[PDB]
Amino acid sequence: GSLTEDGLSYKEKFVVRSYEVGSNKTATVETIANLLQEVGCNHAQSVGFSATTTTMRKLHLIWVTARMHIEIYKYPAWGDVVEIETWCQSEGRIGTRRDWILKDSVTGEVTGRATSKWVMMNQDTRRLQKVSDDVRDEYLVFCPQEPRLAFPEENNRSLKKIPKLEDPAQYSMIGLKPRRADLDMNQHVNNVTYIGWVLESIPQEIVDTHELQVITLDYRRECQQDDVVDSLTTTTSNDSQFLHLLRLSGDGQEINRGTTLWRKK
Amino acid sequence: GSLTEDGLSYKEKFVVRSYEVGSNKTATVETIANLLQEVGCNHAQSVGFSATTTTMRKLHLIWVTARMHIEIYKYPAWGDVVEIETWCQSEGRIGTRRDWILKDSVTGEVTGRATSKWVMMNQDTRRLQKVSDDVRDEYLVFCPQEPRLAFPEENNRSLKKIPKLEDPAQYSMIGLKPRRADLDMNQHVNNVTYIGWVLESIPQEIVDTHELQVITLDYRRECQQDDVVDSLTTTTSDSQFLHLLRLSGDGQEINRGTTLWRKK
Numbered sequence: 001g002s003l004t005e006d007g008l009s010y011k012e013k014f015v016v017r018s019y020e021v022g023s024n025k026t027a028t029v030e031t032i033a034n035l036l037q038e039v040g041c042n043h044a045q046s047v048g049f050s051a052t053t054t055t056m057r058k059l060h061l062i063w064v065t066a067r068m069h070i071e072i073y074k075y076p077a078w079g080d081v082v083e084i085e086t087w088c089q090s091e092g093r094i095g096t097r098r099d100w101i102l103k104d105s106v107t108g109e110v111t112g113r114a115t116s117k118w119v120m121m122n123q124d125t126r127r128l129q130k131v132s133d134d135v136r137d138e139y140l141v142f143c144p145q146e147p148r149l150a151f152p153e154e155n156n157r158s159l160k161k162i163p164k165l166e167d168p169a170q171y172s173m174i175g176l177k178p179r180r181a182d183l184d185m186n187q188h189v190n191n192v193t194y195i196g197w198v199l200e201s202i203p204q205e206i207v208d209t210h211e212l213q214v215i216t217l218d219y220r221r222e223c224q225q226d227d228v229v230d231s232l233t234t235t236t237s238n239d240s241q242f243l244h245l246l247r248l249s250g251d252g253q254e255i256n257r258g259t260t261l262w263r264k265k
Numbered sequence: 266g267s268l269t270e271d272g273l274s275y276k277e278k279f280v281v282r283s284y285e286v287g288s289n290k291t292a293t294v295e296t297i298a299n300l301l302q303e304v305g306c307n308h309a310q311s312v313g314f315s316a317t318t319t320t321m322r323k324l325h326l327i328w329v330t331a332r333m334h335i336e337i338y339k340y341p342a343w344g345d346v347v348e349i350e351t352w353c354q355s356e357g358r359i360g361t362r363r364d365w366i367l368k369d370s371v372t373g374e375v376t377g378r379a380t381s382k383w384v385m386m387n388q389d390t391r392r393l394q395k396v397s398d399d400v401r402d403e404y405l406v407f408c409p410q411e412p413r414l415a416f417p418e419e420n421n422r423s424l425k426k427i428p429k430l431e432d433p434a435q436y437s438m439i440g441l442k443p444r445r446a447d448l449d450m451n452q453h454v455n456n457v458t459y460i461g462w463v464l465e466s467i468p469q470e471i472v473d474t475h476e477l478q479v480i481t482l483d484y485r486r487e488c489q490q491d492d493v494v495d496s497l498t499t500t501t502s503d504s505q506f507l508h509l510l511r512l513s514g515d516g517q518e519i520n521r522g523t524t525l526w527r528k529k
């Protein structure tokens with residue numbers, strides 16, 4: 001992988017592995033989400049990090065995911081090479097955004113795109129806060145100054161408000177729990193695990209006859225290593241749409257909400 | 266990746282990814298096991314299975330894993346490049362073996378080794394059988410003819426008999442179930458999932474103070490997509506453990522194994 005000429009974005013190529021693909025012999029959406037995290041991490045390393053700015057480490061502040069939106073037009077097949085470009089942007093005092101574009105390395109065509117919103121949190125108290133003047137200054141040195149959006153359209157799916165699923169859910173998968181492979185190097189549940197858990201409550205018949213086109217996830221609370229989760233889904237709709245809710249198995253505390261759009265094969 | 270000069274083994278390099286490492290910022294044993302499957306698959310593709318031989322497809326025969334043994338001396342760190350070499354061998358009518366050697370790409374030093382035993386099964390009836398002359402002849406064309414072993418030592422850990430854990434287990438993790446990410450492209454539970462489930466019943470304190478050096482797994486029955494599993498572990502001792510995976514309801518054995526851990 002490498003930073004581009006202007007030093008304001010990063011590109012990396014990945015060969016899709018045998019264990020990374022589903023029944024259609026193309027990369028799962030969780031494989032795509034893991035590749036997005038990996039190219040994001042390689043970009044942060046290339047621009048000097050170990051993207052928590054200098055003032056953030058002094059103030060015990062970290063970035064946490066508020067929303068993730070992914071749209072895939074074609075999933076890369078096993079053995080294919082996919083090129084992913086990523087960049088960051090400051091969104092004033094609200095937070096930051098990381099965007100990605102996925103292309104078929106052979107044709108150069110866009111096969112997918114993604115965007116994520118991140119908010120600042122105190123690592124100790126877990127209290128959210130606005131981005132201060134000093135943090136914005138440090139973050140702006142490796143971002144494009146003019147807006148550069150993976151989803152530019154002035155009425156796009158990535159900015160839609162998601163409602164809370166009301167009981168009873170049409171479908172459910174109960175008693176989901178993370179194992180060590182679902183944790184990251186800091187022993188937190190990896191964000192991609194929540195995508196997998198959301199998808200567990202979609203009927204196998206939809207998965208067999210449809211391809212996932214869009215997924216939007218709204219992160220509300222972090223699942224602990226010893227937590228147990230229920231995944232709920234209700235159909236809202238040649239396209240099928242669903243509303244999703246992840247909540248703790250016991251008290252029902254919301255952890256995530258989202259929506260998915262599927263197109264008939 | 267590429268076949269070697271003689272066309273009898275295959276090598277591939279992998280850069281360890283951020284999501285592939287554990288709390289020590291080195292690759293987990295499940296990441297290593299997935300890389301072993303991937304280099305094995307690239308080798309099979311390079312030798313013409315673009316490794317079920319021509320006569321196996323006509324007879325509805327497939328290879329299934331009987332045992333997996335992995336020994337790691339050093340886990341590669343996040344961002345490091347690891348080179349893995351793999352090859353296969355016919356073991357008469359018993360079955361076949363796939364072996365692997367892992368090296369640090371910068372130093373050329375051996376950092377790990379693995380070996381796996383495979384037996385022939387009818388895909389429809391699920392009945393096991395001996396390999397047969399025609400299948401051995403077809404398999405021998407891409408294998409070394411003289412023995413080449415990742416574990417040559419005459420009484421090494423990869424060939425030890427594993428006993429059945431007796432109740433009560435010292436530790437347990439119950440109600441484990443596979444999700445779609447644990448399945449392979451044919452909707453079967455990926456073999457690496459069983460390594461993860463075995464490790465779930467090891468106390469977090471051992472994981473925090475020790476590094477896993479050796480794991481041996483004996484595969485007895487396949488876990489279905491809708492099955493639920495219990496993972497049991499008892500200390501037999503470095504720390505050593507005996508493991509058992511069984512179905513949560515009736516207690517049908519699915520796997521048994523052992524692990525050896527070295528103090529950090």
Ligand SMILES: CC(=O)NCCc1ccc(S(N)(=O)=O)cc1
Pocket residue numbers: 064065066121126127128191219220221222223
């Ligand atoms: C007060 C408050 O909301 N704090 C943020 C806690 C917090 C919520 C969600 C996540 S995530 N992206 O892992 O789902 C992390 C931390």
Ligand SMILES: CC(=O)NCCc1ccc(S(N)(=O)=O)cc1
Pocket residue numbers: 329330331386391392393456484485486487488
């Ligand atoms: C009669 C008999 O044992 N048939 C083999 C069944 C069989 C057992 C185990 C596995 S594995 N490698 O997925 O754990 C697959 C198939």
